[PDB]
Amino acid sequence: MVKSFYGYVRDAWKNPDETYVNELRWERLQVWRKQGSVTRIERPTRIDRARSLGYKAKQGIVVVRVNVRRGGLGHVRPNRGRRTQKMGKNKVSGGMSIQRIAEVRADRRYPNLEVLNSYWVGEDGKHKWFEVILVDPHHPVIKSDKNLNWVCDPSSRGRATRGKTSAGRKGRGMATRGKGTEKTRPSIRAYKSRGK
């Protein structure tokens, strides 16, 4: 088993409760809770995950940690007449996942980049921290980079807000094909939102 060290990082992060990642988790969440909603970091907390998701060690790529509240879409009780099925909102969690929420907040704070992907990095009772990869589509290195130069196209600006990232496509019910995607692909809006 001549395995790269990225494999060892992935092994350490496969079951993080029963590895050395638990000690680092207890030491790291103290610093992470104090930080802001969208915090920039030097290196990704899990380098193998970022590299498989598309991170490269070059300028014009930014990695940011985002804190998102745990739980579903907290909603307001309606103050006007509802038919008793559209009146209850405590047991309603929306169609926006927390990963999409974190990606959209990272895209909001960093307007001149694009959200590439993101991955779970840690969590506690009240928060979920996600590390979001962003790309600079106007840096010359990304312009020259042929494996990232698709992002310079006009159709790629606003990926995380048009549901084009991997968490976005998962949330739009496009992880699979065949049966079950009769009302999701090619878009939720195409079938009057009946899928999802």
Next chain:
Amino acid sequence: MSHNMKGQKKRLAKAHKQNTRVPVWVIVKTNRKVVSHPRRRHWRRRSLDVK
């Protein structure tokens, strides 16, 4: 003596000079087909939408 700034008095000046009849030669040139415009008004009526 309402106390206007410069722009308010400029708007009232334009409103004042809009409130004049069509010239006689315009009526003569147009074969009397242009005899008025909508901006005629009197000060003791509907107030200006100026200030």
Next chain:
Amino acid sequence: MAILRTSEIRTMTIEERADELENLNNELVRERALTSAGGAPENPGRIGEIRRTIARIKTIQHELNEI
């Protein structure tokens, strides 16, 4: 014919262009000053042609990089 053609403005110099602009502004001041009494100009096309001439001279000056 015209007050002064733009080719003649290109023929002129910087000092002569400034002198022509000064004289044209002074004559436009005189023509607009007489109309403050309301009396029509003896040359009613003169005012518009002098303004167009001033525009043409300013265009030539900006083309020649004077200001």
Next chain:
Amino acid sequence: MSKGTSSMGKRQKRTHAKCRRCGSVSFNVHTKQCTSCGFGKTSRMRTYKWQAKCKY
């Protein structure tokens, strides 16, 4: 004193001034927002789908 013509002579003041961005007399003087174009509240122009009818 009445609610009709008696108390309508107190209309010697304003609540809407002529907005800069659109030249309409809709700029509220207390909320600092034009209720026609939304200047003072947003960079974009306020336009809603209920300002016209459903196109079908």
Next chain:
RNA sequence: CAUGGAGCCAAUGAACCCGGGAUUUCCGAAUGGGACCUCUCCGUAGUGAUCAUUCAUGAUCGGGAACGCUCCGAAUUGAAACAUCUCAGUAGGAGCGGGAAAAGAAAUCAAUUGAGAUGCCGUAAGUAACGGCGAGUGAAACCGGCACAGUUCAAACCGAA
């Protein structure tokens, strides 16, 4: 627009139309500070906010008839009442965005053996399915077409090449 008086422009080729420039006050994304003041104060002359970077420079901001994508989301009404249902993911809202956008190259659909990305059109079909199994809602595959397109990363091995 709109062949009135008096002049002016035009054979140094105007007017007019196409193309390329100049000028383009103040506000407005409005962006040096400020707005019941479309102006005003400081002038040390203005890159306001959020960002990328080699800190040279660069990006986003607003608008656009509808369309596109993402998320949030009623009630009238129908059931001859009405609550599941329907109205309807409609109306409306928030974000993003281009000339198109989304989709997209199987951890697929089939059936005993096959096909070979996606979209859209016809049909399957008011069928399967759902449903106070009430009222109603309601596909896809196969198939016939429009059009045809396949690939790039992570990793193994090398190690600044």
